[PDB]
Amino acid sequence: IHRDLKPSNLLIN
Amino acid sequence: GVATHGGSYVQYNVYGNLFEVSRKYVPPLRPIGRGAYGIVCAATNSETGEEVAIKKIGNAFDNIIDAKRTLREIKLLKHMDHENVIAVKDIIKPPQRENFNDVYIVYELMDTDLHQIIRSNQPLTDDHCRFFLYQLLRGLKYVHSANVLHRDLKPSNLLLNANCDLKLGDFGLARTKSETDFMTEYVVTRWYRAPELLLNCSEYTAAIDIWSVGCILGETMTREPLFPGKDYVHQLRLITELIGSPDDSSLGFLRSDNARRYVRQLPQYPRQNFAARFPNMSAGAVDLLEKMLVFDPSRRITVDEALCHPYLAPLHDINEEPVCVRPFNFDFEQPTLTEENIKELIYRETVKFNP
Numbered sequence A: 001i002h003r004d005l006k007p008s009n010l011l012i013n
Numbered sequence B: 001g002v003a004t005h006g007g008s009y010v011q012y013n014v015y016g017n018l019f020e021v022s023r024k025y026v027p028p029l030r031p032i033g034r035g036a037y038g039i040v041c042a043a044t045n046s047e048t049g050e051e052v053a054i055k056k057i058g059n060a061f062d063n064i065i066d067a068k069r070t071l072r073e074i075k076l077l078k079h080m081d082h083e084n085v086i087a088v089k090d091i092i093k094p095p096q097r098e099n100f101n102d103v104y105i106v107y108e109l110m111d112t113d114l115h116q117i118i119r120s121n122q123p124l125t126d127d128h129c130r131f132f133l134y135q136l137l138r139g140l141k142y143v144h145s146a147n148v149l150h151r152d153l154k155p156s157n158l159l160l161n162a163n164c165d166l167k168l169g170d171f172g173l174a175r176t177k178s179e180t181d182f183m184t185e186y187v188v189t190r191w192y193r194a195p196e197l198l199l200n201c202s203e204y205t206a207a208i209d210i211w212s213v214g215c216i217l218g219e220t221m222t223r224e225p226l227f228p229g230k231d232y233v234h235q236l237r238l239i240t241e242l243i244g245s246p247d248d249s250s251l252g253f254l255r256s257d258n259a260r261r262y263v264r265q266l267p268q269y270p271r272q273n274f275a276a277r278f279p280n281m282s283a284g285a286v287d288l289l290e291k292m293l294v295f296d297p298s299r300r301i302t303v304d305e306a307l308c309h310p311y312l313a314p315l316h317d318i319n320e321e322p323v324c325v326r327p328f329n330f331d332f333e334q335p336t337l338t339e340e341n342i343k344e345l346i347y348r349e350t351v352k353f354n355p
């Protein structure tokens, strides 16, 4: 994938 | 744990529910979800050093409808082989074929699901929505090419990892594009059903999945369900409060005057401008949402057209969007299907995993 749109990693409990 | 059946199985107590599983599955045991049919618990496979999700389906063979859903879940998921479809790792062999009541399906373990993420106290940017939607459509492209309609898409069936990888799960209500039948199994969520389903249409197409996709996309943008009807009449009304009351051409797919009068006894509403209702959001996203949430299914955008929508152009690549070259051909509607032979089939699938 392209750093132009890699979403940030999600917080999970 | 209490080992039983000679030590070959072990029972664990998980918040009162007894999991009886084969010995290689050990704690820590983490409850990670509960649906209408399965209670799901993470565990460790000690033979491979992996974490897994074990879903217990209690009383799976009590009637023919529950039996078939368990059979569809297993056969469809063993059929699919795709990055955006959840994989089955194991099906636990019952200790004795004579007393086979609970089915344990062992899945690959995911961190969470899209419902929990939508409700959580963190941002969902335009890139999250685009990335979730792309993978959802990508997996649906593959599923539909295998001649299967998922029929029950909702945020809590879209399994997610922290890196935002998404996997479709929960195929028990799926149909082949040939067995299209009127009966709609009880869900605890009518909120994602297309109007064809709400109005008991017996013929319907891949458009019902696209409707659910639009409900999901809209929920990722607003962080609220679009259409949380408290019953099925309220549900239709909330739909027409957003997109407007259907004109006569949009009602063409209905097959009775009864269903026709049902819809027209509702209060009539004008079709709202989607930009007005969803301001300060991505124009590509609103545009795509409006093309999915179309009352008339013959006028809804398809999965393939959605993958070529501008909103997804950053991610779209035909080289990375396989189809299923092996169509699904099992017929869950043979008249010689009973709870007892469905039990035998599933028992056979478990021996494929544990001879």
Ligand SMILES: Nc1ncnc2c1ncn2[C@@H]1O[C@H](COP(=O)(O)OP(=O)(O)NP(=O)(O)O)[C@@H](O)[C@H]1O
Pocket (backbone or CB within 6 Å): B032, B033, B034, B035, B036, B037, B038, B039, B040, B053, B086, B107, B108, B109, B110, B111, B112, B113, B156, B157, B159, B169, B170
């Ligand atoms: N492989 C998995 N990894 C992580 N979480 C899972 C996994 N499978 C299911 N879950 C979670 O456990 C819950 C139950 O999943 P699901 O398979 O939908 O239950 P079900 O009763 O079989 N189907 P439904 O009645 O439609 O919810 C869901 O809310 C998921 O978030």
Ligand SMILES: [Mg+2]
Pocket (backbone or CB within 6 Å): B037, B069, B070, B073, B170, B171, B172
């Ligand atoms: Mg299921």
